[PDB]
Amino acid sequence: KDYRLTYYTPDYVVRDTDILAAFRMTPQPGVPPEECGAAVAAESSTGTWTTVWTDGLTSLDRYKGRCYDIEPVPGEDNQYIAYVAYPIDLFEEGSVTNMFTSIVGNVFGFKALRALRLEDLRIPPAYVKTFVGPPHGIQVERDKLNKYGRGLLGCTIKPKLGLSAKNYGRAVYECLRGGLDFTKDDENVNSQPFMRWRDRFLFVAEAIYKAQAETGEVKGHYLNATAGTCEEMMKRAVCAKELGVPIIMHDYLTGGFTANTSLAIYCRDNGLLLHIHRAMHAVIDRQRNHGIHFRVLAKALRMSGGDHLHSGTVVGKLEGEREVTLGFVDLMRDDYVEKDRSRGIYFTQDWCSMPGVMPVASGGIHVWHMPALVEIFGDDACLQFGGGTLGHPWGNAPGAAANRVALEACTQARNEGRDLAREGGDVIRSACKWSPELAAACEV
Amino acid sequence: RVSPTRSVLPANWRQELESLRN
């Protein structure tokens, strides 16, 4: 337990099958960095003490994480990055639950640390291949939805007239008919006295099929399957299956990894798409000195399984916070990601053909952010509009139509070689001339 | 939980239990 010479082994060669972790570490004053890195490597069975009391185990001889490198953080005075290698034998194959239990189960309480943040993980190909992963992934999703060469467009339904299931479905119909690919159950809408889940599912299925008959395009609504129990959760997933509807939704951090992985496997087995909402992520991922950075939680989700993931907004963020967001968007979507510290990527990640996950971005209040979103995310993203469609003065369907026109004109202009950073306002104003819906949204 | 106040055993309690055992 934290001997510093057992666990801090700076000449260790990292194996290919090891799981690597990068901990941003804030030691208590007077505690040297090598002692802290070793303590995090060791996960000592005493977290109050910070000393080796009971030393010599077969859980601590070959099944030990080793701190193989400690680096200073530039500009900080008491913060270090500690790199820990874990042997792949520590982990239950295919269990995100068990990997977090092994890595983050205990060390965040260790008294020798003042603060501890888990920045990144290197998931080796040998561990990656034990997971079912996302039910479809971005490519399969585009083939199943028949939708190519632009972002997908969503919006959250907040009805003006009631939260009843029937009014909920009316609003879904109005948004989808106007041009959106998807609408979205709010993350707290599970099954309440004002709106029981099975009534919601039925009226949303009528809305999806009505807008699909009308538009001739494939339409969905993310039907929230999050439940108190796995059996209730699967009752909802089964209902969606039987309605033949395309997509369901789960709040993976509040339901849990055990339930999320069960759901992702059901969705792979029955061809449902799985939208993943990240409620409570800011409880864990917000503070710079403590918790678990979202890129780790996104990597976990990609392993547990999800076809879409809420990935934040880039509205109102500085270039440096935008570098970070694009880092984890690459970890979500790509097959191979190279080490890149300025994007916060501490490890080369090889996904070993595990399907990527579509990031879902909050678009802003208005449609003038459309050029920036298309330039930053590219085509493989859902842009969610929280009130673009509904703050529109003519209502949900022209608001949807205004978002779709703006996305398509920005896509056209991007393919034509125009610079959306410079000319995006000129692209929108030029589409306003022929689109009355977009012209009315830009009057706002 | 209340503080257990002690009870003095009756005089020659030892003599009382010994008779009973026999």
């Binding site: - | 009756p10 309690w13 239990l17």
Partner: protein, 138 residues
């Protein structure tokens, strides 16, 4: 370096790892029972009924989980409602052991507020029981 013996070394839950409680030690525990408003009661069992066993599980399908026979012992008279003096329990302990010399005897206590058994410790081991060790159990 000594070896905790596995032979004839049965335990009877609370206080069985201590030396057998003397009369003064039993009286002081009864004072704890009385001060709390608890209801003392005595229970007894023969050696073959004294410790946990599984023999009824032969009748069962897959529901043996936390079932065990011989948790229940046999009540000696009645719960001593209104017991205030410890000498009544000590007299009842003597009477039970006199009527049942081959029996283990345990003193239990009930809390009528929380409506649940709240104590249970042994007050008498039978001499003729070879199942247990006389605190040279190593």
């Amino acid at each position: 370096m000594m070896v905790w013996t596995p032979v004839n070394n049965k335990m009877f839950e609370t206080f069985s790892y201590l030396p057998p409680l003397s009369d003064e030690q039993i009286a002081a525990q009864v004072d704890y029972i009385v001060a709390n408003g608890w209801i003392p009661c005595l229970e007894f069992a023969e050696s073959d009924k004294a410790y946990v066993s599984n023999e009824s599980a032969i009748r069962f399908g897959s529901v043996s989980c936390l079932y065990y026979d011989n948790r229940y012992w046999t009540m000696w008279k009645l719960p001593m409602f209104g017991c205030r003096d410890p000498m009544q329990v000590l007299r009842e302990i003597v009477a039970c052991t006199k009527a049942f010399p081959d029996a283990y005897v345990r003193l239990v206590a009930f809390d009528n507020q929380k409506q649940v058994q709240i104590m249970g410790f042994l007050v008498q081991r039978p001499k003729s029981a070879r199942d247990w060790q006389p605190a040279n159990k190593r």
